[PDB]
Amino acid sequence: LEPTDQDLDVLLKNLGNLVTPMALRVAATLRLVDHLLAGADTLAGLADRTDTHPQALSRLVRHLTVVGVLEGGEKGRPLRPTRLGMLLADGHPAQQRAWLDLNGAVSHADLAFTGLLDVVRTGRPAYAGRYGRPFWEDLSADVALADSFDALMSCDEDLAYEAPADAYDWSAVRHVLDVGGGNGGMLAAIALRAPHLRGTLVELAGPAERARRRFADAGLADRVTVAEGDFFKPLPVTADVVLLSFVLLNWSDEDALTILRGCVRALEPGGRLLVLDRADRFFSTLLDLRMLTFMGGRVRTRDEVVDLAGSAGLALASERTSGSTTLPFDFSILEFTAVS
Ligand SMILES: Nc1ncnc2c1ncn2[C@@H]1O[C@H](CSCC[C@H](N)C(=O)O)[C@@H](O)[C@H]1O
């Protein structure tokens, strides 16, 4: 097979092109598109507004112009965003400015892709090697990263947990242990549907503080408590339901297995462990590699999660997938009992 001239062009400009995506990141971070729409239309205007090196900005703008993000500045026209480039305006619903924003979590973590060689060699995440602590520990301690990460997730939205909370009968459940519950979305939606239910959420310090507030706002502090803990350590209480809501997919087979054994150990006799989790080919492989490189996890099919659960000492007892309007993906509750 013989590479065409069009093949080499696509590899240089697109697939092998590391330079342009960093230019787009820098344009988002500097709010370049917003500053042009706000009246700026000369390189030195823009440089003035962004506290950047005029000459170096010119050179970044040159490149953004070639690649179709900006137009103008004919060297006499006014510098301006293209149709494409308006994706980096602040209010655009696709939020691409925030995705690419280097202050934000996703773009900041994307930089770790420079260590992808190591990630393919060892199967370990690159995030720590670049920033000094692993991804969730980093987010826990730095609120701007955690809130920028959350804002981009559809799970952050108001009614995001209503559907999964509706797909499961909570009426006889006494105590939910919500392992890695984040800011408490699922548990709050559970507690509201089941007034006698008690909850314990286990989190790092960052999300724990945000859950304390969600549970107070919701009139739930009396029966839903927040404990700072490490779900690699033994869990601080037992429960007739243990809940892992969008947690497993962040962890390697190895890690996800030590978490699950930790949950089984906390599971009261006869109790249930619930895992809530879950052109087109491109976006899943993109997410998959981010998941791998950011934190060492992966999107795991139903069967995979079931054998994984199997080696932690759990048998499947029911599955149930469904859609919501609000979630761009379908969700899925797997329900396990202890085999012993
Ligand atoms: N060692 C650890 N101990 C407790 N929580 C941890 C942890 N490592 C990561 N986490 C937490 O795991 C969560 C995963 S994402 C939030 C999941 C939440 N249950 C939801 O429904 O969306 C993060 O909030 C992160 O703080």
Side-chain angles (χ1 to χ4, degrees):
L1 300 180
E2 272 275 354
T4 55
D5 287 318
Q6 300 180 0
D7 285 328
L8 182 52
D9 203 59
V10 169
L11 180 61
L12 286 165
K13 284 168 181 195
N14 183 159
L15 312 176
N17 186 166
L18 194 76
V19 171
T20 297
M22 284 309 311
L24 263 298
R25 279 170 179 75
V26 165
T29 301
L30 293 181
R31 299 179 166 269
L32 243 43
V33 168
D34 302 320
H35 287 130
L36 299 167
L37 290 157
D41 66 343
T42 57
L43 160 73
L46 249 210
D48 300 0
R49 280 98 158 159
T50 53
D51 293 333
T52 47
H53 200 258
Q55 206 184 73
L57 187 62
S58 104
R59 300 162 73 180
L60 173 85
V61 162
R62 265 201 253 147
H63 187 262
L64 294 165
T65 293
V66 186
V67 299
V69 175
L70 305 177
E71 67 197 12
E74 279 185 354
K75 300 180 180 180
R77 246 102 126 180
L79 197 48
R80 179 196 182 200
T82 62
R83 189 190 57 257
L84 178 321
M86 289 296 299
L87 283 166
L88 309 207
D90 195 3
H92 194 280
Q95 300 180 288
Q96 281 297 296
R97 192 219 77 84
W99 278 95
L100 290 161
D101 178 14
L102 289 163
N103 294 330
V106 178
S107 205
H108 192 242
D110 274 343
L111 301 198
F113 266 99
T114 51
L116 220 216
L117 186 57
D118 232 82
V119 175
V120 177
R121 280 194 181 144
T122 69
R124 271 245 187 157
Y127 194 91
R130 185 177 168 82
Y131 295 120
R133 12 190 163 83
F135 175 85
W136 293 113
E137 286 178 42
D138 209 33
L139 296 223
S140 177
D142 188 317
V143 190
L145 293 182
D147 301 338
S148 67
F149 187 68
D150 285 342
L152 294 171
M153 298 336 135
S154 66
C155 287
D156 184 50
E157 287 301 82
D158 280 335
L159 342 158
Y161 294 95
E162 296 292 307
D166 281 336
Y168 197 96
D169 182 23
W170 308 106
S171 45
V173 168
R174 296 168 307 279
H175 186 16
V176 174
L177 204 213
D178 180 11
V179 176
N183 43 249
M186 191 53 188
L187 182 65
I190 283 171
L192 289 174
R193 238 147 301 246
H196 305 127
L197 177 322
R198 265 67 196 155
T200 303
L201 177 144
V202 175
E203 256 305 331
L204 303 171
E209 180 180 0
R210 283 170 281 181
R212 276 185 206 111
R213 165 144 140 158
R214 192 189 219 84
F215 297 147
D217 289 344
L220 297 172
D222 67 320
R223 54 190 179 101
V224 183
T225 69
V226 174
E228 312 212 342
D230 177 5
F231 61 37
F232 296 110
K233 312 293 185 182
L235 295 166
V237 292
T238 62
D240 58 291
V241 159
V242 175
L243 170 60
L244 287 159
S245 164
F246 303 104
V247 177
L248 288 181
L249 92 166
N250 309 146
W251 296 99
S252 55
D253 290 350
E254 293 70 35
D255 283 331
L257 177 64
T258 137
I259 289 160
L260 276 164
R261 292 179 163 144
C263 295
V264 168
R265 174 71 176 138
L267 193 69
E268 293 172 19
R272 301 296 199 267
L273 191 151
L274 317 181
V275 182
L276 165 63
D277 224 299
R278 200 61 152 190
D280 67 281
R281 180 180 180 180
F282 171 92
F283 297 105
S284 51
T285 55
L286 234 201
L287 168 59
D288 184 69
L289 300 186
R290 291 181 149 143
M291 274 298 328
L292 175 55
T293 297
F294 288 11
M295 47 205 88
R298 86 201 153 99
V299 173
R300 254 175 298 235
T301 74
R302 300 180 212 180
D303 309 320
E304 286 168 326
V305 177
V306 170
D307 307 336
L308 197 54
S311 120
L314 296 154
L316 188 65
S318 66
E319 208 206 295
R320 46 190 101 188
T321 87
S322 190
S324 70
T325 56
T326 82
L327 293 196
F329 48 90
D330 300 40
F331 72 87
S332 154
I333 298 180
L334 299 149
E335 180 199 35
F336 301 89
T337 42
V339 352
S340 57

